[PDB]
Design a protein around this ligand. Structure first.
Ligand code: FAD
Ligand code: FAD
Lengths: 467, 467
């Protein structure tokens, strides 16, 4: 008789969870090692708490102002952050148990180890247990899903100051009167707007422009939206010195001296691979410290796989989870590959930013001839009925075939409409085909149809005679 | 040389507008006859003003209460309906000019006639001009796009009372202290909730249950939502007598006497065909007075077509417009057909109701073997982060092929997510295929993926290990 394959999984986030359970489903015995709180980033200090805080911020914002204030009185709502934090944390704790702890526990095929793991060789790990001492974990196959951590730049004086990373910001029980934010990452912007809406006077220090690595139209729309609601966005600005004196932060910048009660550093994230002793297992990493893998999540060592934020993969929990599931399949004798061709991405600012497929620049870089159309939101019925036309919907197609290969949008509910675009791309639809489909009038997603029609029709024909 | 085809179009709503412009594009000369305001129903007294009022109502509602009131103070906002009405009307007037008047005017190929048309024979119309007198309009082909009007039941005393139809309700400059609503139609419910949120004490008299003709789960969720915010829903209730005494309505019902300041009658709509003298042109209508047509919008008379609410077609402006465009193609020698297989439908209540494709009952009626899954919103991350789990997402598939053939949902933003379902159905995707696609975490549309996964996975595996 054959013994169950011994699978070791380092981490307990989205990638590790998906892998652990898939491995067990495929008949393997799993030993999962986690050094901190079970659940990793998303449920504890990532997606979940941040989206909850953003929703609370949205309510506070709408109680403060709206496009209908001429007929509906508005007020400055009193905010009790302690109560909001308690509500937020209760849901986080509830989900951690329901989707992580409760599933890992009570399963004789899964052994959870509380400690920090490192490779001993390519078939075993050495674990420094949280309760002291060590333990060796032998394995046939191992999945590294250690995620990433907030990056902290070597700005003089920052290291020893009481600054915040996204974790401390989300866990704060008070809304600071003044919040300075260093960075222009998605995390930086989502938190910047949430705190602003909850009461903070926010100043964002962007080294370049917002969404510098994305299509330029995106950063322009978001920057204008932030400024419109009192958020200061200092472009091409960096702090050369950080100091904390007399109970406040003092930042020396290229724009002058800036003072704030709290400082959020959200420049980016780095892979958690330095404590893994990857060299002992022959696992190669790139210049950024990320573990190199192929579409099957296989590393340079045939018996070791990697998935999630500790690799070069896009940093989204749904990508990490999909990768973990497929890595487990391959660790158990299968043959699976991760396809990210129609991977959507959403930024939970207001308006939201959403993208899928190729941007014009990205297509060109890959030698693809394209054409595009950019429809401003003042052409979308839903936006007009809401009296909020900030934003746009951009479609990118391949020349000749007219196949839709990319969509970028800045608009309320962009995250919802982007999935229609994702399916259109997945099914290799042309813009003509998308435009000929029936869409509900007065929905934001109708904007996709309207934009598609502009490839063969005039903007003046939309919502009238563009069929 | 050949002369331009003479096309007559009766009406100026979505169907007529799309047809008129398509006909001209195809080389025809158009004579469009309209007895009332240009633009018809949607822009003037339908979709546009109603969605604007609903958005205003949403803001008022959120300023009054939210799932985050434990940490964000709320207040009863003062409402100035005169100001809201002015804003609403200005957008309506703006859109009427931009998408209707400005496009019809200044075009030598289009002649707009202000009057009421009726058939003289199958090649001409007699028009009673609004300014007096008549005119004959000869045509080679004619499109009837006369729409429908609010139905008014023969309830004793109703006829002579100062009741409202959706038109008077949308045009009211005051929010009534008490509003009674007779009917359970989409129009009745959308307006009922809007007025309630803007300040009225609303009572809905439904002859049966809400969404009686739809899947039962829909009516149950909507009824619970209405009651949750103070809207009284009297099921299986009809008014046997209407009276207006001492400045108020007095309704005798099976539930007892009900008094209200205003009365909205929104039971349904009837086709505008009684004044057309259709018999003079040999155009057949059904028992409801609707004009009978085929998929090419052709009537019993080869030279006359019909599209929109005056036919048996679904009453949506996007359906009317699509039909008008295709009718114009056929009137000008083409061969087009309207495909409604993936037609989405949205109800702008909160939560919204959205459907596409077959419901279980509808599939069975057509001899299709099916299976389904109903995912309650407390299983959708976005709903949980919003602390509002009222609703559900239901998927209907064909047995054997596992092809998705229908989706019904009750949830915030259901109108946005339903389009993803529409494209999935259009592309004949199976639930497994839909479930294997990447969806953004914490978006309502992710609910489609989660529901799809329940066809092969347990609800406890969702957002964890259902891959
Ligand atoms: C503020 C914020 C907001 C975000 N918003 C979104 C969003 O809206 N949508 C989205 O899809 N993604 C979002 N993300 C990103 C998403 O959270 C991550 O991509 C995802 O959680 C990564 O999952 P993972 O399994 O790769 O890693 P992780 O969940 O980060 O976990 C790795 C785990 O391994 C442990 N570990 C590390 N080294 C060792 C070791 N040597 N031994 C034992 N255990 C070790 C860690 O302690 C941790 O528990 C957000 C992130 C943040 C920080
Ligand atoms: C309150 C309300 C809310 C709605 N919400 C939505 C929604 O959210 N989404 C959606 O898609 N649909 C919605 N609808 C329905 C949508 O408005 C209609 O289906 C659509 O407007 C019908 O277009 P049509 O061109 O067929 O007719 P219409 O736009 O109704 O116009 C027919 C025109 O012909 C004229 N006419 C009639 N008889 C004659 C004659 N003998 N001679 C000359 N002119 C004549 C009329 O006066 C009118 O201008 C709503 C309707 C109402 C009333």
């Amino acid at each position: 008789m054959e013994p169950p394959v011994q699978v070791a999984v380092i981490g307990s986030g989205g990638a590790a969870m998906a892998a652990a359970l898939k491995a067990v489903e495929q008949g393997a015995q799993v030993t999962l090692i986690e050094r901190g709180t079970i659940g990793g980033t998303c449920v504890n200090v990532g997606c979940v708490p941040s989206k909850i805080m953003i929703r609370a911020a949205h309510i506070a914002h709408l109680r403060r102002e709206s496009p209908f204030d001429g007929g509906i009185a508005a007020t400055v709502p009193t905010i009790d952050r302690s109560k909001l934090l308690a509500q937020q944390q209760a849901r986080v704790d509830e989900l951690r148990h329901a989707k992580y702890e409760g599933i890992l526990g009570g399963n004789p095929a899964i052994t959870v180890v509380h400690g920090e793991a490192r490779f001993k060789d390519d078939q075993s790990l050495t674990v420094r247990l949280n309760e002291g001492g060590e333990r060796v974990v032998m394995f046939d196959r191992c999945l590294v899903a250690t995620g990433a951590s907030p990056a902290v730049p070597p700005i003089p004086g920052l290291k020893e100051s009481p600054y915040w990373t996204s974790t401390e910001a989300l866990a704060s029980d008070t809304i600071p009167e003044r919040l300075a934010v260093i960075g222009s990452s998605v995390v930086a912007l989502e938190l910047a707007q949430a705190f602003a809406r909850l009461g903070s006077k926010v100043t964002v220090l962007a080294r370049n422009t917002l969404f510098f690595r994305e299509d330029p139209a995106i950063g322009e729309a978001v920057t204008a939206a932030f400024r419109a609601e009192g958020i200061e966005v200092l472009e091409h600005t960096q702090a050369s010195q950080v100091a904390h004196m007399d109970g406040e932060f003092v930042l020396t910048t290229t724009h002058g001296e800036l003072r704030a009660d709290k400082l959020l550093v959200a420049t980016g994230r780095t892979p958690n691979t330095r404590s893994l002793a990857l060299d002992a297992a022959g696992v190669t990493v790139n210049a950024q410290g990320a573990i190199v893998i192929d579409q099957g999540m296989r590393t340079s060592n045939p018996n070791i796989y990697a998935a999630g934020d500790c690799t070069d993969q896009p940093q989204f929990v749904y990508v990490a989870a999909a990768a973990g599931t497929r890595a487990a399949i391959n660790m158990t004798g299968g043959d699976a590959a991760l396809d990210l061709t129609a991977m959507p991405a959403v930024v939970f600012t207001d308006p939201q930013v959403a993208t899928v497929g190729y941007s014009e620049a990205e297509a060109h870089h890959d030698g693809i001839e394209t054409d595009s159309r950019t429809l401003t939101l003042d052409n979308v019925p839903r936006a007009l009925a809401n009296f909020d036309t900030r934003g746009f919907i951009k479609l990118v197609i391949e020349e000749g075939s007219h196949r839709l290969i990319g969509v970028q949008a800045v608009a309320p509910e962009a995250g919802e409409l982007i999935q229609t675009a994702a399916l259109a791309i997945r099914n290799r639809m042309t813009v003509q085909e998308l435009a000929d489909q029936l869409f509900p009038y007065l929905t934001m997603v109708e904007g996709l149809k309207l934009a598609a029609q502009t490839f063969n029709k005039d903007v003046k024909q939309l919502s009238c005679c563009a069929g």
